[PDB]
């Protein structure tokens, strides 16, 4: 009654036979914006089942030298499905997410993955330059990787200059290949403003990192992917206009 779960959102559903509970970030569920907190006067749109549903990215393959990957949300979804279209025609976006990560292997494999959810996840230039002129900055394709994800140059300091060991403050879970093959976190809408622009601003990144490296003795399966499936719980859109991809 624990390790077996099913998640049904929209026309999509996810089953897992090996799971460690579910994390509900900061003890809240996603929700629609209350009349008292709202500011913009126009009426938001609420597609429900056409937007809220599980989208599945490509799989990141899992090696011994892998340093770990990250994504940005909503950014990964801005080009996909009806969710990507609404976010282009509207200036004001709000919602939560349900994040699900699939990695499996066999009882002769081993490793662990740290899966975290980082609100306002800021990447950082890498260089010794102390002058804001000559100092390096990351590129747009790095800051906002898209569907293809990005990779860590320094996974230990999380590329932001902050130790990985304290990442356990964020809502997280581990994939420990002897214990569970999935990690699921349900993120509420977090932001200092009720609505925002899905295009200019990403609420939070996702992070998958090998704290303990993958090991398998020869003859077993070398190819392990990491798949990601994310659903936008409770979506709203406002400020309808023409289409802007960026």
């Amino acid at each position: 009654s624990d390790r077996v779960a099913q998640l049904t959102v929209g026309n999509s559903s996810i089953t897992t036979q090996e799971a460690a509970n579910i994390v509900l970030a900061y003890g809240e569920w996603p929700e629609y914006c209350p009349d008292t907190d709202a500011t913009a006067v126009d009426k938001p749109t609420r597609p429900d089942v056409s937007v809220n549903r599980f989208y599945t990215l490509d799989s990141k393959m899992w090696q011994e030298n892998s340093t770990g990957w990250y994504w940005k949300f909503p950014d990964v979804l801005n080009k996909t499905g009806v969710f990507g279209q609404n976010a282009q025609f509207h200036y004001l976006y709000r919602s939560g997410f349900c994040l699900h990560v699939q990695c499996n292997a066999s009882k002769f494999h081993q490793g662990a993955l740290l899966v975290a959810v980082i609100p306002e996840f800021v990447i950082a230039g890498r260089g010794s330059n102390t002058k804001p002129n000559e100092a390096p900055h990351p590129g747009f394709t790095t800051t906002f990787p898209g569907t293809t994800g990005a990779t860590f140059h320094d996974p230990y300091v999380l590329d932001s200059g902050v130790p990985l060991s304290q990442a356990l403050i964020y809502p997280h879970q581990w994939i420990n290949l002897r214990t569970n093959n999935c990690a699921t976190v349900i993120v509420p809408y977090i932001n200092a403003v009720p609505f925002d622009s899905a295009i200019n601003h990403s609420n939070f990144g996702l992070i998958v990192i090998p704290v303990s490296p993958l090991k398998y003795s020869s003859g077993a399966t070398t190819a392990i992917p990491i798949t990601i499936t994310i659903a936008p719980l409770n979506s709203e859109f406002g400020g309808l206009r023409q289409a802007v991809s960026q």
């Binding site: 390790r3 509970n21 003890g27 214990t179």
Partner: protein, 51 residues
């Protein structure tokens, strides 16, 4: 404790503005269970977590 009849006054404000005042009124509220144990299915300390 103690301090019998010490007639303390601090929060009295001399201005018409709320932010001119002085901290605090304190707060004793805590909710560690949102950061420390933010899981859907509650887990007891007796039971094993995974069954």
């Amino acid at each position: 404790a103690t301090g019998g009849s010490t007639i303390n006054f601090t929060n009295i404000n001399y201005y018409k503005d709320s932010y001119a005042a002085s901290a605090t009124r304190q707060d004793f509220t805590q909710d560690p269970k949102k950061f420390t144990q933010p899981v859907l299915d509650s887990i007891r300390e007796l039971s094993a977590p995974l069954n």
